[PDB]
């Protein structure tokens, strides 16, 4: 959509190839973010709790 | 931790709903400001305060 | 790890197709392959463990310069996952494929003079498991092949009974042997007992389990492929298919 | 004629060269900061009476849920910390760890292996030697502190040279009596009861007068790059324990009375910018060491 | 044969048989968590230029309000503490305060009175005898680092027995000169500037050649369970503070510089198991003295 | 009568007389604050993602944001607080800031600059004088321990004397052998290792018999008012780091290995409790000296 | 035990201690910053027809408008960094240029005062002594590279000590034939043509063959924090420039050939670290002043 282009062209077009077309052409969502981990317990109540 | 997230959304609503009876505490002008997007006047006060 | 869980013959042979050789060496100073060493299992024993260090182990260690070096490198990899450190190899190699070094003459490496007992000596063969001793009698026949040393191959396997009987069946020429074949010669993979987080003994052992425990993990991570799932999303080189042969053969 | 030196400089052992890369610091920070984690959740596990809290920060430590019967001690993390604290010691050490358990055990925080964030102060004091004539004996003891005894019984007084190194950055130095002290080559001044050296002014030059034994002693201050998460209290308890759990023990290695004389004694060394700095690695990995082994205690006396 | 030994070492007094049991444990706990509280509000009060939450640190520390023209002493808490103190140094001691404010206090926090959690290294040198011949002259000087001091005015050289207890785990040994140093019925070996030993392994026998005197300098480690909330810095600052407060101040008892001298010398006594749980309490109490006295000076 | 004294007593120079008023003690209470925050700001952006801790806590020190080109030093704060130690430390030094500067950087923080409301316990020992008989050799070593060994070649037992000012609250000495020790006109006790003494009370009297040489190891402590936030570990680092860097190079001045050694050398001159208030200022200045140049190294 | 040393290292005169601030910093950065403006300006002036670049160029450099019948001289910019310029050099000069006037100049441009975020290497050789024996010449000429010729007219071998200063990095040392070096008490090893040495090691004994001289060619490599615009080669002409133009002119001062025998010799003085800061301030004035010299002619 961005770059003129279509499937079969950026067909066997590795990750960092792609990156480098989207961020000339001024596109900067190219990476994945990470997502942090929130630590949970249960109380135990009747159980042993986890 | 699940239990530092869930203390700070219960006493966050009961601060909000308090402050928001009777006659608010904050005066419409800052309400128009925070409403601009499309929030209600509640929700954006919320989110300011955090 | 990658090298660890290819079950087949297939599979681990296209994987050796598509690895470089950079892959088998460390670049790691490492130490010395044979010594009596004192270690640390406190899960088990206040008292240092003892146990000896080995050349098939998930660790850098010092190996020999000549093809003698760089050929048990290769296998360790195969056989434990990590090589060996052999400094200054020539660029042409490094660049060069596993599967090329062991069954092409374009490189320029003499393995007409090597002997099997004394590389079964070194990469320690009393320790292996029968998964890696299998994966050791593969290497050693695409060496023959290319050497043209079939003979000494068979004079080897008739000295040791057991590695005859579960030797590999295969011709290092032929793609329809390969798939053929029905052997299993997966080390690392998803286990079918319950695996814990515990350490082990042996540094082979704790090794071993490092990378079972890995892999693991890596199957429940995004760089894992589910075939089921995402198989028009591979391309059409990667993707599986009835007629994929491998270059010559 | 007669030479003295410090007995904590002489012949400092070679130290490892493995797990000194990038990734390896990221797993010794790493382990810092969880074990950090681990001793405190373990003092609000006590305040609060419950185990939740330290039962979630051993979870994130070792990857597993204790059972109750079976002894903690760390997993992984703890078994891949006490064999890295051995390889930095020495040569000899078996250096048996893989690279995989070492990029997975990094990953856990988000965390940079930085050696060289900031400074930290060590108090030991180098003395290479102390030439002294034939008639006049020199006796030195101590390392954070150095008392050097000099007695002439020669008939006239006698100029003994100092060698305090060129690693030092300030040397002070205090006598029982008033003495003189000078660089070489220069004036005598007068007799005073304290100096403030430079080491790398150049070797000094004492006056023994005939009677009464001279006693001086001796304080020196070295600055070494240190990461921030340092903690030099915390880096001389995990040291007596590695060596009291018997993590040192390997064949032709010397045994230090502190981390204070083994930094200094390999500072004080051919290719000592080298050594330093894998020594420094080690002071952060006996750092985590002993806050882990203090809230997952196993020895029972 | 002449006998040397180390002066912190000599005579350990008996410790207190009070105050020992779960509930004072808890007690003390609870000081020394009621403490830091009150350090900590202090230094908040000074920040935020407001002295709120100093009064309900001092509430809940002494059950009444700070008065400006009243002192402000502590409250009972203190007054227990104090006693408390006294109580664990000697066996001469009063040990006046009832159970019933014992456990009235041991309420005010929720903290197990668990004291062996953990542990920590107490680097004092037990040197229990030198044993030397004729014409060899011994001296041991120090506790955290003990130098000893040998010469022989005989004509051949001289065997100096060293017993360093059973209780260190490591020690140690650095000499001025390069020494030969050996194990009982063992060969002696070549002459080096360092040795490492186990004290439990049998004594140890130094050549110790004619001229001139040959000093060696002595560095122990020993491991002590202690609880989790031992703090060194604090306690041997509590140690000081008592000693000059006077509560020390018992007849037929000893002195000592530091606490890990203190601690070492009750463990090396004819049965030093005993002594090591009461002296750890009261290392305890020390931190919670030091830290409630900063706060509250008189 | 020969006279040995300790060597870090002698001719203690005179302190500086600048930066003593009330806004002056704010500004280095305030040093010490966000000092504080710059050190822990740091460890928390380092354990995560993100530095905004660290801007947050630099922008409030330097009064600017940091920037990737220029380097760290600290801003105006770090000038000033530089200064003001040099200041302290010799009457000589000049005194560079203006009281405007002061008072500005003064006003960050809201904190009470209150220099004597806790106090610390320091392990300097001071040995005014040991006067000793004609036949008799006296050397003393070390401050934090003292080390008095006395040899006498005469024929009967000498008589020494020791002094050991006015100002330490306890000392404790140890020796190598059970000695004799008592007060001016006090009879003999029997030969004891160890002997606790208070200095108030008057010069002792020690026994020295003929051979045998007896050393004597004091360990004292002295009481010190300074503020809640006094650390003496960060103090001690802040001394070296100071020193190594040139903050008290002047002429005509003593240099000491320990800020303990600095501040016992104060107390025992002449005007000595005017001259210690100066110097636990500067002890705080150094405190906060020591954890902005860790966060910022140059 | 003759002593031969540089002539370039004697007698290191004081510098100014004046417009060494971080207003004054910024105003020789700025400075250097707008002569980079003006000589570019005045090239691509040349290049076109127009010269408005170098009339804009002119108005922010001299804040007035440049006229055809009227001289150019550079305006208030140029005549306070030529007052500058003298007060770095030595301390007598009369430093005559108010601080109002270099804030309001530095306020042109927006531009870090910092001097220490690079480097630069320089090449002046420092032979600080070469303590040669009896019977023995040493003659020690150059800066740059050293060439020094020793002759021994004596059949005994001489043992000669090289001094390097203990502040150079690494030294390299050519001979015309293999000679023989090693430290004080290491064995001396084979002839060799090269040496590569460490000055922090210590003196250097050289061996001397009795029947031909020996003459050794010296280089050595010294790093110095200078700042990121440094430009050694229009540093190096600015220095000759300014020595020309009577800049340097006062009484009780030594001269030096370049700016590398310049920042080296006082390196060298007692106090080489606070006198460098100043000289590689002086470096970058001086840099501004050759570009602003050479763009505008009077």
Same mark, same amino acid.
Request: hydrophobic letters at 45%.
């Given at each position: 959509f961005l770059t003129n282009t279509t499937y079969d062209i950026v067909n066997n077009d590795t990750i960092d190839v792609l990156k480098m077309k989207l961020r000339n052409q001024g596109w900067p969502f190219v990476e994945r973010y990470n997502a942090v981990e929130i630590d949970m317990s249960v109380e135990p109540l009747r159980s042993p709790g986890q | 931790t699940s239990g530092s997230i869930i203390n700070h959304a219960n006493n966050l609503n009961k601060v909000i709903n308090h402050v928001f009876a009777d006659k608010p505490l904050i005066s419409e002008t800052m309400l128009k400001i925070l409403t601009?997007?499309? $929030? $209600?006047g509640k929700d954006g006060y919320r989110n300011w305060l955090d | 790890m990658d090298v660890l869980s290819k079950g087949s013959l297939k599979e681990l042979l296209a994987h050796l197709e598509k690895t470089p050789l950079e892959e088998a060496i460390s670049y790691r100073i490492g130490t010395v392959p044979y010594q009596n060493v004192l270690i640390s299992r406190n899960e088990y024993y206040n008292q240092l463990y003892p146990d000896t260090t080995s050349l098939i182990d998930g660790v850098s260690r010092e190996g020999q310069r000549n093809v003698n070096g760089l050929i048990m490198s290769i296998i360790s990899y195969v056989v434990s996952g990590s090589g060996h450190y052999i400094p200054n190899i020539g660029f042409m190699l490094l660049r060069r494929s596993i599967l090329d070094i062991l069954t092409?003459?374009? $490189? /320029?490496?003499?393995?007409?003079?090597?002997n099997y007992g004394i590389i079964a000596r070194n990469l320690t063969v009393s320790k292996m498991n029968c998964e890696q001793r299998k994966r050791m009698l593969i290497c050693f026949k695409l060496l023959a092949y290319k050497d043209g040393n079939q003979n000494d191959y068979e004079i080897y396997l008739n000295q040791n009974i057991p590695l005859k009987q579960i030797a590999p069946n295969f011709i290092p020429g032929d793609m329809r042997t390969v798939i053929h074949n029905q052997d299993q010669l997966a080390?690392? /993979?998803?286990?079918?007992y319950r695996l814990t987080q515990s350490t082990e003994l042996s540094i082979r052992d704790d090794n071993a389990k490092s990378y079972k425990l890995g892999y693991v993990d890596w199957y429940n991570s995004n760089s894992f492929l589910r075939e089921r799932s995402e198989f028009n999303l591979i391309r059409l080189k990667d993707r599986d298919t009835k007629y994929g042969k491998l270059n010559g053969w | 004629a007669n030479r003295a030196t410090s007995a904590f400089l002489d012949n400092p052992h070679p130290v490892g060269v493995n797990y000194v890369d990038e990734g390896s610091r990221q797993f010794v920070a790493v382990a810092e900061l969880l074990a950090s984690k681990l001793i405190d959740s373990s003092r609000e596990s006590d305040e609060s009476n419950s185990d939740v809290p330290f039962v979630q920060a051993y979870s994130k430590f070792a990857d597993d849920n204790p059972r109750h019967l079976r002894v903690k001690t760390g997993g992984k993390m703890a078994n891949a910390l006490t064999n890295v604290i051995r390889s930095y010691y020495?040569?000899?050490?078996?250096?048996?760890?893989?690279q995989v358990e070492i990029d997975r055990l990094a990953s856990k925080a988000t965390v940079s292996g930085d050696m060289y964030n900031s400074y930290a102060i060590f108090n030991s004091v180098p003395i290479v030697e102390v030439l002294s004539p034939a008639r006049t004996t020199v006796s030195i003891v101590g390392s954070d502190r150095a008392d050097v005894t000099m007695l002439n019984t020669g008939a006239g007084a006698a100029n003994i040279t100092f060698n305090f190194g060129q690693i030092a950055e300030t040397v002070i130095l205090k006598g029982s009596v008033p003495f003189q002290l000078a660089r070489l080559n220069q004036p005598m001044p007068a007799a005073r009861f304290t100096y403030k050296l430079r080491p790398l002014d150049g070797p000094f030059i004492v006056v023994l007068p005939v009677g009464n034994p001279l006693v001086i002693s001796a304080t020196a201050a070295t600055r070494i790059q240190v990461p921030l998460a340092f903690n030099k209290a915390l880096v001389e308890s995990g040291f007596q324990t590695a060596m009291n759990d018997g993590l040192?023990?390997?064949?032709n290695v010397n045994y230090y009375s502190s981390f204070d004389e083994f930094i200094i004694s390999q500072y004080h060394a051919q290719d000592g910018i080298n050594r330093v700095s894998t020594c420094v690695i080690l002071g952060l990995a006996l750092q985590a060491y002993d806050q882990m082994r203090r809230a997952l205690p196993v020895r029972r006396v």
């Open positions: - | 601009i997007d499309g $929030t $209600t | 092409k003459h374009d $490189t /320029g490496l003499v393995t007409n003079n090597l080390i690392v /993979g998803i286990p079918a | 020495s040569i000899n050490a078996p250096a048996i760890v893989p040192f023990d390997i064949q």
